[PDB]
Amino acid sequence: SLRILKLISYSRGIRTLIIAVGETVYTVASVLTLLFLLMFVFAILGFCLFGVTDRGDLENWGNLASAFFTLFSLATVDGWTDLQEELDKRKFTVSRAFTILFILLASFIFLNMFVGVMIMHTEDSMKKFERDLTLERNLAIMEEKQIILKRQQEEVNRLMNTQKSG
Amino acid sequence: PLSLWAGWVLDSSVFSKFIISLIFLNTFVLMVEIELMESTNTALWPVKLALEVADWFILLSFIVEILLMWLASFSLFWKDAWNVFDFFVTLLSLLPELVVLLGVPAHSVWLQLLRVCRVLRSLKLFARFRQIKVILLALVRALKSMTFLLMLLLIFFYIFAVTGVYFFREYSRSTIEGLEYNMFFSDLLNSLVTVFILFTLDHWYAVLQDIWKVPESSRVFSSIYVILWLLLGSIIFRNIIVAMMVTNFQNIRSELSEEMSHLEVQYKADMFKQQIIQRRQ
Amino acid sequence: LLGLQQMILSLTQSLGFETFIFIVVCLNTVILVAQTFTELEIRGEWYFMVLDSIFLSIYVLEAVLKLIALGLEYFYDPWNNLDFFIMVMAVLDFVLLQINSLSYSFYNHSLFRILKVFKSMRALRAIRVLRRLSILTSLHEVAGTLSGSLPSITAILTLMFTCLFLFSVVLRALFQDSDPKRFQNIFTTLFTLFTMLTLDDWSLIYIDNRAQGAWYIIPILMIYIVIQYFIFLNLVIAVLVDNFQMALLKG
Amino acid sequence: IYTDFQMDEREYAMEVGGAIYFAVFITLGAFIGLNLFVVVVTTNLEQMMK
């Protein structure tokens, strides 16, 4: 697959797309760091809420890797129904409120913020490129017009010189 | 006659009303007949047969429609715009009559594909509104702008799928009796299907828990690989496609605004030259 | 009692509609949100429907006043047309309960639930007529800018209806004698298509269709899913983003 | 939930009516909410670029 990636390393058109989308690396890294911080905050919160009491709910808010994976699933839409049915039997009524608050924070913030950020970044990156292309076409048009005007002036001067000398 | 008759029957509003009435009657009748073909109502059995034969009569109306089409430019119409696709669909809708007259359809009839083809042709030739055609023009120019993004999407799908074929190999190729997602990661086509499922992101939690039945080798490479693939691919591709879509809308509206601005400038110049002419007189 | 009655009705309608209607509708929605409330109905269930019938009588008095009022100008208002429909169904169910006897099924039937949802949309009307004051300008502007682009969203939802009907037709056609117990009729077929559009256990459908003998139906279903899902979300997201974006560009 | 309220009468009952009611309500509310969320986000990001 790395060899196939070296194959697709060609196609200067794809290269231009890569250049046009390459200025958002810092932005997506910043959003990824924010999302990682949110995972860390709710990871320690879910551990302190369900795994320290050690009365069940193991490998969902217990061990660190399984807890992180369950938090990622809860930040997405998948698995939330079965996770809720698993957690509501652990004698924790406010766990449902905490989980729906976590959903309405994490899922909405991550998805909508990412789509908005990328939408503005690509719109403003395409806008300047299209403006520059139209500007270069404009300079080409004015250069052609100036060349035509110079040729017409030279022809008029040559005609006047021939009329004067004849 | 011929082309003049075709122009007259296209211009007449009674013929257009009749053909659109027959079209939506046929679409409404079509899915009724598949509901019941038994002796639940012996009184409505002959009239249901008569309704199916009325559908055959709509097919005959399609043959006289292609006769009116022969009254047009004839050989020039064999290579044209979407009208030739409509002609091909009407031919494919005439085909089931032949394959039930001589084909003995106790086999793979494929009558349903031709039926849905004529249904979509009827649903498209329904005198589509202005508010349909403007967004359809936007969609087709959007798919014209879909030049390199789609090959980027399919090639990233290709590389990630062929990478993930031999990563959870010990999932399907294990001797665990109790498992139900083993079919997902077995074949290359199965790998394509399951990474497409991961791309749509449905029950990724349940998929991960079902792959967790593999002996956990400290999750150092495989689980992080599939999680990063699903997250990055889904968010990046959905995001770049929506960003290009809003960019298409932006440049469509920019072109419309600059056309209106040029029209207003031309109107200002026209009124200024009208004042110039009035003073010159 | 002609035009003189009409203008007297206009002035006294302004006065008594500001005074009487507000307080009685406030009491109506108070008793109705106490009525729904599926814990306190057993702490009651006898002081509830008597007040419900009393306030339905108040609402039919509102209907009688609106009928004796100016008329056609009232009928021009879609909300008042909804009021007329409300009161038609209210007098219908009231006389149906009043006549008693009858010959059909009762004791919390489907007709009773129809009357219950009629009471619910009556409660919705009470809520919508209490908000004559202080609807708040921020969400007023938000709702106006949201409702500005109505043709575009109607076009896109019409395209969904056409595409979903086509996909349901072709799936029902290809699914004959193919354990169709989940989609044996029109409603179940369209509901399975709705789940297909809303990403609910389509992986489960793939894995329990692999247990069947048909395999080529899975790529077709997959490609239909992805094209309809991509195309619709992208169309609506862009349409509403620009719909608020010219409002952003303005003041 | 669909299987939970399934088999009211096995043919139509309320299983058609209430289901299509809350299904169209769900799809309209979900689309409107997601659209409004991304609209507010892109609005405040346009404010940021301004």
Curated annotation (Swiss-Prot), chain A:
Tissue: Testis-specific.
Residue spans, topological domain Extracellular: 47-67, 88-93
Effect of a null allele: Mice are normal but males are sterile. Male sterility is due to defects in sperm motility unability to fertilize intact eggs.
TM region(s), chain numbering: 1-11, 20-46, 94-119
Localization annotation: Cell projection, Cilium, Flagellum membrane
Cytoplasmic side of membrane: 12-19
Intramembrane runs of residues: 68-87
Domain of life: Eukaryota
Function, in words: Pore-forming subunit of the CatSper complex, a sperm-specific voltage-gated calcium channel that plays a central role in sperm cell hyperactivation. Controls calcium entry to mediate the hyperactivated motility, a step needed for sperm motility which is essential late in the preparation of sperm for fertilization.
Family per similarity comment: Belongs to the cation channel sperm-associated (TC 1.A.1.19) family.
The protein's assembly and partners: Component of the CatSper complex or CatSpermasome composed of the core pore-forming members CATSPER1, CATSPER2, CATSPER3 and CATSPER4 as well as auxiliary members CATSPERB, CATSPERG2, CATSPERD, CATSPERE, CATSPERZ, C2CD6/CATSPERT, SLCO6C1, TMEM249, TMEM262 and EFCAB9. HSPA1 may be an additional auxiliary complex member. The core complex members CATSPER1, CATSPER2, CATSPER3 and CATSPER4 form a heterotetrameric channel.
Protein name as annotated: Cation channel sperm-associated protein 3
Organism: Mus musculus (Mouse)
Curated annotation (Swiss-Prot), chain B:
Domain of life of the native organism: Eukaryota
Intramembrane residue stretches from the record: 187-199
Subcellular location: Cell projection, Cilium, Flagellum membrane
Residue stretches spanning the membrane: 14-36, 46-71, 81-105, 109-127, 145-167, 220-246
Disulfide bonds: none
Disruption phenotype: Mice are normal but males are sterile. Male sterility is due to defects in sperm motility unability to fertilize intact eggs. In mice lacking Catsper1, the sperm lacks CatSper2, while in mice lacking CatSper1, the sperm lacks CatSper1, suggesting that stable expression of CatSper1 requires CatSper2 and vice versa.
Tissue: Testis-specific.
Residue numbers on the Extracellular membrane side: 37-45, 106-108, 168-186, 200-219
Side of membrane Cytoplasmic, spans: 72-80, 128-144
Family: Belongs to the cation channel sperm-associated (TC 1.A.1.19) family.
Protein function: Pore-forming subunit of the CatSper complex, a sperm-specific voltage-gated calcium channel that plays a central role in sperm cell hyperactivation. Controls calcium entry to mediate the hyperactivated motility, a step needed for sperm motility which is essential late in the preparation of sperm for fertilization.
The protein's name in its UniProt record: Cation channel sperm-associated protein 2
Organism: Mus musculus (Mouse)
Portion of the full-length sequence here: 94 to 374 of 588
Swiss-Prot record, chain C:
Topological domain ranges for the Extracellular compartment: 38-46, 100-110, 175-185, 199-215
Intramembrane segments: 186-198
Protein name from the UniProt record: Cation channel sperm-associated protein 1
Shown segment, full-protein numbering: 337 to 587 of 686
Domain of life of the source: Eukaryota
Function, as annotated: Pore-forming subunit of the CatSper complex, a sperm-specific voltage-gated calcium channel that plays a central role in sperm cell hyperactivation. Controls calcium entry to mediate the hyperactivated motility, a step needed for sperm motility which is essential late in the preparation of sperm for fertilization.
Transmembrane segments annotated in the record for this chain: 16-37, 47-68, 77-99, 111-133, 152-174, 216-241
Assembly and oligomerization: Component of the CatSper complex or CatSpermasome composed of the core pore-forming members CATSPER1, CATSPER2, CATSPER3 and CATSPER4 as well as auxiliary members CATSPERB, CATSPERG2, CATSPERD, CATSPERE, CATSPERZ, C2CD6/CATSPERT, SLCO6C1, TMEM249, TMEM262 and EFCAB9. HSPA1 may be an additional auxiliary complex member. The core complex members CATSPER1, CATSPER2, CATSPER3 and CATSPER4 form a heterotetrameric channel.
Swiss-Prot record, chain D:
Organism: Mus musculus
Signal peptide: none
Residues of the full protein shown: 242 to 291 of 442
Record note on disruption phenotype: Mice are normal but males are sterile. Male sterility is due to defects in sperm motility unability to fertilize intact eggs.
Tissue: Testis-specific.
Function per UniProt: Pore-forming subunit of the CatSper complex, a sperm-specific voltage-gated calcium channel that plays a central role in sperm cell hyperactivation. Controls calcium entry to mediate the hyperactivated motility, a step needed for sperm motility which is essential late in the preparation of sperm for fertilization.
Protein name stated in the entry: Cation channel sperm-associated protein 4
Superkingdom of this protein's organism: Eukaryota
Location in the cell: Cell projection, Cilium, Flagellum membrane
Subunit structure: Component of the CatSper complex or CatSpermasome composed of the core pore-forming members CATSPER1, CATSPER2, CATSPER3 and CATSPER4 as well as auxiliary members CATSPERB, CATSPERG2, CATSPERD, CATSPERE, CATSPERZ, C2CD6/CATSPERT, SLCO6C1, TMEM249, TMEM262 and EFCAB9. HSPA1 may be an additional auxiliary complex member. The core complex members CATSPER1, CATSPER2, CATSPER3 and CATSPER4 form a heterotetrameric channel.
